[PDB]
């Protein structure tokens, strides 16, 4: 069981795709990185996700092109591909469960496609927040607290927007009392009604 301090890198673009990973605790951010250091978020992975799947294809013969970061303190398992490939070719059942895990990854990414497809950033934001509710939400008298520290920057990198825009949108959502924010934990007040 490995641990990663918050903001520690799990793999860098350019690193051989040596291992597969399983996320026990915390959130992992996958992103694409650009020459100047800008990053675009491509996935925010929730507990119990398999990831690093490019090694399931090319194994260490190929290089990472996304950046994997411990978005919160993380705990995870990982194993070179042949170790995995052995464990599978050996334990048939296990594979049925990784097939399920991968199927989940795909359905989750497609939900982000849906979030990103909205033309107006306001809905893009609510929709992204509703997903986080589901992935990391904690029940509350108000509604649901997204148990992650979310900077305006981090949100911008994930819904395709600038930070200034996120700030304005977030302020608008509070003015209207659909959300509260405290030390970066966002609480969504009426999740179910927001899925309108």
Ligand X SMILES: O=C(O)CCC(=O)C(=O)O
Positions touching ligand X (CB under 6 A) are 17, 30, 43, 51-54, 64, 66, 106-107, 110
- The Cα–Cα gap between 99 and 106 comes to 11
Cβ nearer to ligand X, comparing 38 with 114: 114
Cβ nearer to a second copy, comparing 128 with 136: 128
Cβ nearer to ligand X, comparing 132 with 179: 132
Span near a second copy by CB under 8 A; candidates 2-10, 97-105, 131-139, 185-193: 97-105
Consecutive H or E run containing 30: strand 28-33
- The Cα–Cα gap between 19 and 54 comes to 9
Q: Which does 164 bind (CB under 5 to 8 A by kind): a second copy, ligand X, none?
A: none
Q: In this chain, which of 33, 56, 79, 181 binds a second copy, going by CB under 8 A?
A: 56
Nearest to 32 by CA among 21, 22, 42: 42
β-strand partners of 47: none
Helices (H), the chain: 54-58, 81-90, 92-117, 121-136, 152-159, 163-175, 191-194
Cβ nearer to a second copy, comparing 98 with 181: 98
User: Taking CB under 8 A as the rule, which mask of x and - marks residues 153-172 in contact with a second copy?
Assistant: -------xxx----------
Strand order in the sheet with 19-25: 2-4, 74-80, 19-25, 50-51
Q: Which does 17 bind (CB under 5 to 8 A by kind): ligand X, a second copy, none?
A: ligand X
* Least distance (Å) between residue 77 CB and ligand X: 14
């Amino acid at each position: 069981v490995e641990t990663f301090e918050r903001n520690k890198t799990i793999f860098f673009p350019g690193d051989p795709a040596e291992r597969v990973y399983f996320l026990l605790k915390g959130a992992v951010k996958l992103s694409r990185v650009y020459e100047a250091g800008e990053e675009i978020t491509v996935a925010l992975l929730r507990e119990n996700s398999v990831f690093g799947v490019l090694s399931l294809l090319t194994g260490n013969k190929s290089d990472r092109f996304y950046h994997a970061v411990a978005f919160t303190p993380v705990e995870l398992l990982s194993a070179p591909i042949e170790q995995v490939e052995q464990a599978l070719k050996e334990n048939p059942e296990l594979s049925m469960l990784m097939l399920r895990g991968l199927s989940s990854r795909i359905l989750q990414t497609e939900m982000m496609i849906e979030t990103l497809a909205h033309r107006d950033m306001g809905s893009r934001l609510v929709s992204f927040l509703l997903i986080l509710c589901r992935d990391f939400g904690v029940p509350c008298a108000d509604g649901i607290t997204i148990d992650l520290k979310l900077s305006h920057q981090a949100i911008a990198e994930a819904i395709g927007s600038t930070r200034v825009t996120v700030t304005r949108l977030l302020g608008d959502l509070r003015e209207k009392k659909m959300i509260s924010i405290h030390k970066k934990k966002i609480t969504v007040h009426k999740p179910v009604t927001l899925s309108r």
